[PDB]
């Protein structure tokens, strides 16, 4: 059945709940953003309102064919009113189109849904500042100390470079990059940028990425893999077998294969620096596992919160576990003795 930390009190709204068929007294679903988690279960059948993004009602309509009539379009930054209820979308700084969610409950009390996030300084200065929030619905995917990592800013000048370098040195290596879902396109762009190529994919993965609003986006991609040196694909096919098969493909116009896999965490953050990473090698390919993250650090997450000082947290992530839960729970009450809220 739907969880309670999908549903908003007071209202008849969920968050990020279509995969429970008919939620009983659901009024409004909104979506934050367009990731399969997140939007499991809608399609072209669906007929309740959807409120969401410009950005994520342009992938509903194209993607999943969900019907013009039930996509409702929010602009960002602005005051709107919802089934009687005063909503408010923010940029989560997670992937394009991505929002958190203000609601101003008709009995006084405020909520902010961070949806899916990357917790930055900037947010101390939207109309987040305006007002108190009582109530935190949070993205506590990495809620524990161990998870630090770079800037996305000291992630893509490593990526840059590294590319930059290796094609100069050798005009006949082809860069690879991988990915699942929208979102980090910034890696592929960048490194796309400094060649002076564009990147090259499906059509699947182009007609995604023309859904967007991402400026000069015809100047950056396109579906002719012959004239692009920069290929986008499944990351599922980012490894040793499914390179060696992707080089053949390319009818001896490359020699060699540099790839970057962006990954959430992985456990050389706990050791290793960015500028001390180094790829997996075997024979002409080599595999450079990026700590690119589209969500908050720890440090980050605690910041956030410090700052906001809300009477409520409610998780949404690693809520399947006591143990998990547990943890969390004891660091939230850590920040709050910290800071004295
Ligand atoms: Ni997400």
């Not at 949070?138 to 524990?144: A, F, G, M, N, Q």
């Not at 994919?201 to 100047?219: A, D, F, R, V, W």
């Not at 020699?255 to 050389?268: D, V, Y």
């Amino acid at each position: 059945t739907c969880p309670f930390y999908k549903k908003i009190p007071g209202t008849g709204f969920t968050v990020d709940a279509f995969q429970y068929g008919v939620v009983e007294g659901c009024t409004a679903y909104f979506l934050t953003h367009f990731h399969s988690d997140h939007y499991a279960g809608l399609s072209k059948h669906f007929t309740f309102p959807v409120y969401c993004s410009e950005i994520t009602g342009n992938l509903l309509k194209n993607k999943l064919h969900v019907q013009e009539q039930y996509i409702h379009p929010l602009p960002l930054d602005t005051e709107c009113i919802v089934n009687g209820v005063k909503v408010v979308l923010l940029d989560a700084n997670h992937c394009p189109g991505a929002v958190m969610i203000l609601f101003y409950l008709p009995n006084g009390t405020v909520i902010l849904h961070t949806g899916d996030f990357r917790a930055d300084p900037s947010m101390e200065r939207s109309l987040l500042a305006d007002q108190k929030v009582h109530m935190l619905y949070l993205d506590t995917t990495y809620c524990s100390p161990e998870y630090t990592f770079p800037s996305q800013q000291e992630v893509i000048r490593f990526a840059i470079n590294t590319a930059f370098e290796a094609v100069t040195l050798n005009p006949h290596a082809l860069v690879v990059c991988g990915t699942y879902s929208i979102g980090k396109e910034k890696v592929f762009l960048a490194i796309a940028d400094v060649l002076g190529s564009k990147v090259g994919m499906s059509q699947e993965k182009y007609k995604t990425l023309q859904c967007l609003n991402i400026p000069e986006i015809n100047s950056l991609i396109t579906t002719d893999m012959c004239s692009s040196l920069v290929h986008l694909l499944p990351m599922m096919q980012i490894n040793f077998k499914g390179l060696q098969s992707h080089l053949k493909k390319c009818g001896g116009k490359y020699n060699q294969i540099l790839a970057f896999r962006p990954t959430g965490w992985t456990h050389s953050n706990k050791f290793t620096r960015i500028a001390d990473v180094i790829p997996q090698t075997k024979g002409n390919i080599s595999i450079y596992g990026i700590p690119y993250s589209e969500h908050s650090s720890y440090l980050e997450m605690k910041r956030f919160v410090q700052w906001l000082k809300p009477q409520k947290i409610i998780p949404t992530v690693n809520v399947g576990t006591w143990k998990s839960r547990s943890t969390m729970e004891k660091y939230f009450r850590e920040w709050k003795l910290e800071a004295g809220y």
